Amino acid sequence: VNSFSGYLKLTDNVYIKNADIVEEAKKVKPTVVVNAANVYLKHGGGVAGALNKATNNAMQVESDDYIATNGPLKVGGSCVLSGHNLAKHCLHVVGPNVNKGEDIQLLKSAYENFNQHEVLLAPLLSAGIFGADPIHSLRVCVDTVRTNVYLAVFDKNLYDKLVSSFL
Numbered sequence: 001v002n003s004f005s006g007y008l009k010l011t012d013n014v015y016i017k018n019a020d021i022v023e024e025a026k027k028v029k030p031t032v033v034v035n036a037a038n039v040y041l042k043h044g045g046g047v048a049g050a051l052n053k054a055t056n057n058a059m060q061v062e063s064d065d066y067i068a069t070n071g072p073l074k075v076g077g078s079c080v081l082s083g084h085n086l087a088k089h090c091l092h093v094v095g096p097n098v099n100k101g102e103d104i105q106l107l108k109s110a111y112e113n114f115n116q117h118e119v120l121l122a123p124l125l126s127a128g129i130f131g132a133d134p135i136h137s138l139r140v141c142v143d144t145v146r147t148n149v150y151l152a153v154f155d156k157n158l159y160d161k162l163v164s165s166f167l
Ligand SMILES: OC[C@H](CC(F)(F)F)Nc1ncnc2[nH]ccc12
Pocket: 019, 020, 021, 022, 036, 046, 047, 050, 123, 124, 125, 126, 127, 128, 129, 152, 153, 154, 155, 158
């Protein structure tokens, strides 16, 4: 039993909800919140910009030190950093960004990072400003993640569309 509330159960382990991931994280304070990151950990817009703003830019400060030490992530890769005031940890995961010409096949690799954590709050990888089809992202999530994932989807039309089309 966990403290996630109001989710629709799609499969044994995947749940979904229309919610702002920022407001969700502040309420649940999950062990892990997933950020929709880029390889430079520059949290300028989308989920990343929103999560960073909620940390008063502390996420960006920590991220800049991470990059200065380690260099950029790989597309499909991840790193674990602090969750600041939002969660214990933030798993920064880089899905492919279609608006940059990146290979959508890397979306499965991106979701594989979730399997290293027993429970996660997350957005749909490569959705939104990363320019991929969110129905496809949800399908890859369900077919790749085996741990318990609670998906927040900020857009109700999409949320309703995601539910009604789910196979
Ligand atoms: O796939 C990314 C997803 C796209 C869409 F909005 F349509 F759901 N974006 C988000 N999902 C959940 N919380 C969020 N907070 C800020 C942005 C954001």
